[PDB]
Prior knowledge:
The structure is a homodimer. By secondary structure, chain A is mainly beta. Chain A folds into two domains: about 1-200, Immunoglobulin-like; about 200-370, Immunoglobulin-like. Chain A has three helices and 23 strands. In chain A, the strands form four sheets. A seven-stranded mixed beta sheet of chain A has the order 1-2-12-11-5-9-8, covered by helices on one side. Chain A has a six-stranded mixed beta sheet with strand order 13-23-22-17-18-19, with no helix packed on it. A five-stranded antiparallel beta sheet of chain A has the order 3-4-10-6-7, with no helix packed on it. In chain A, strand 18 and strand 19 (about 315-320) form a beta hairpin. Chains A, B: InterPro entries: Chemokine-bd_M3_sub1_vir, Chemokine-bd_M3_sub2_vir, Chemokine-bd_M3_vir, M3_sf_vir. Chains A, B: This is M3. Chains A, B: Pfam families: M3 (PF09213). Chains A, B: GO terms for molecular function: chemokine binding. The PDB classes it as immune system.
Amino acid sequence: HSSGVSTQSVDLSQIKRGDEIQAHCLTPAETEVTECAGILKDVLSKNLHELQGLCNVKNKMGVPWVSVEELGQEIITGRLPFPSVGGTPVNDLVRVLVVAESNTPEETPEEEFYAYVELQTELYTFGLSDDNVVFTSDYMTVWMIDIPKSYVDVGMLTRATFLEQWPGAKVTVMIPYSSTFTWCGELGAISEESAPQPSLSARSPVCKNSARYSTSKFCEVDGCTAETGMEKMSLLTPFGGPPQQAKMNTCPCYYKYSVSPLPAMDHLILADLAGLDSLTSPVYVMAAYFDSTHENPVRPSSKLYHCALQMTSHDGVWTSTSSEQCPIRLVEGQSQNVLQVRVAPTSMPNLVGVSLMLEGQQYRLEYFGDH
Amino acid sequence: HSSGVSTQSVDLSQIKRGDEIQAHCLTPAETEVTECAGILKDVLSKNLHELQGLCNVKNKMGVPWVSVEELGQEIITGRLPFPSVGGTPVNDLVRVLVVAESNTPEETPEEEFYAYVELQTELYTFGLSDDNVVFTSDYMTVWMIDIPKSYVDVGMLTRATFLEQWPGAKVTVMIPYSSTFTWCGELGAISEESAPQPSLSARSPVCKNSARYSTSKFCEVDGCTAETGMEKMSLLTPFGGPPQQAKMNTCPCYYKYSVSPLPAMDHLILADLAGLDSLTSPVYVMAAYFDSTHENPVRPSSKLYHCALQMTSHDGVWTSTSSEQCPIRLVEGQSQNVLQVRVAPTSMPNLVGVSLMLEGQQYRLEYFGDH
């Protein structure tokens, strides 16, 4: 309804000029709205909802209208459950596409569809203005902007200002984390008398107190020994949550921190998903990691990478996309009903986190921080 | 002693090859230790502690040895009270010099002086390896590395691993904030039994709950009126602190955030310091601010600027260096015993923070973040 998590396969072959949209509208290329605005003018004049096909994952919340009668404003604000850490504070940008739309009122309104969207971070507020517009129609406005990746993360508020509580109003922030993966955070306006309807999305700091894992000193008690197979799983899925159950493994925290020698293994299970037999849309798993390959020790590069693997159900059998740079693998567990996230113990030191995205649920596992 | 804050004037004239040091060891340039090591090999062999002369401010804490018997290590860690916000993802790099050292014993020890220093930030840990060495002696190693300024801020942990609890062991991180200001954070190892001894360095969120300064509705109850001079001072210096009392003004927060109009003022006082008569070293005040010259809407690059002013006393006459772009100004109060930090109302919107550093006291004032 007015909240949830949905997934889908994205084939730019079908999407009209999809390759171009992804390259000039969802990638920091031309610093002018011109190129992208050209591609959308043509494409969106044919299919107004074309962009939705570029969202591998859609995560939405129902947010109540907030009437600021004093200023005649109707506002919808919400903190998106960003799926993975944005990135290190380096000079690397993400091109975000913002879309504001609504249904066309039965009775022709007096007010024009004016909308202003802003993304604020403690230190700076990024405003989507006319100079950011790349497409505009009666009830849909699309803005484009480049923001340092580190800012697109928990801590960024999205505020949409309108002059009317337009029916079916929604604001979507299209966030590409990779060349082949775009995550769409959506704020769906709901009655101002309703309570917020957040999606089932969670953020879990797996290695809380990254000092306890500094040594093999506690392995035994935390159940992280060659005997336990280094598997101390805990349930992610809440109680009244969908049937599919996800679980995270704490032991990988040792292979990332532990200075003391540790048991060697072919692979580690970062997390697993059960219920694959009932899913109908692809499952997405995205990692955030640093690239081992050392470079200039004097001027170290600290760019955070993101790669998203996609497990799909073809004719009933679940198959995953594979990558060489991507430190994680998606393989089924004992049966088909179970999916596992794997990684070579040798990658943990450089792994920042993995995020699980599937119908009705999103889990952001972090192997850093203490909260 | 084991902790404290000290200040001093810096003249690259009195420092043997200071200009070359600053231009090659404290400025991102050649990405190879070669050029800097050459200078230090010559200069430091003559005066092992020459670098200390480049520190305009030195802030040190006493930190307890922490035994890692398991690995046969002796470690000291500490969260340096970085004086100001380091930068945004859009800032460039800063070339940092890290110094590890100890007293030279009269009796030759079994093992050689060994130290491994790393700077871990929230996500990435920068390790100072042999490839970062620019100078080495029996009991002192100096490393150099370029790091985006954004990382250099509270939340950067300094860890130094030794193999013995060497007497007089200390680690120093030299941080250039401008071409004429360098701040040195020091960790002095103390008894394994002792509690850490941080210096009197605070970080104060002047505008806690920045939204409350959104309009002028409450200016009057809040005690911020043109009639009262827009002054609402709160003591920064703690009860058992040095005689020189420092205070911060909250009223400037309105001028930074208020959407409502505010009374025109010739200037605003951000902070003041009493007791200049008893001071024996210069007083430094550094501002962090944004350039008030708009730019590309499609890619709003928010680059942070730093400018440090110096107030000194020459034969009973306190004079201050004046600066251009520097939005702040240092002037005396009613008496020469008081120093005030002034700013034009117009600059508040772009003012991120101002840091007061003097003998025994350092106050980092932040005009953003309710924390």
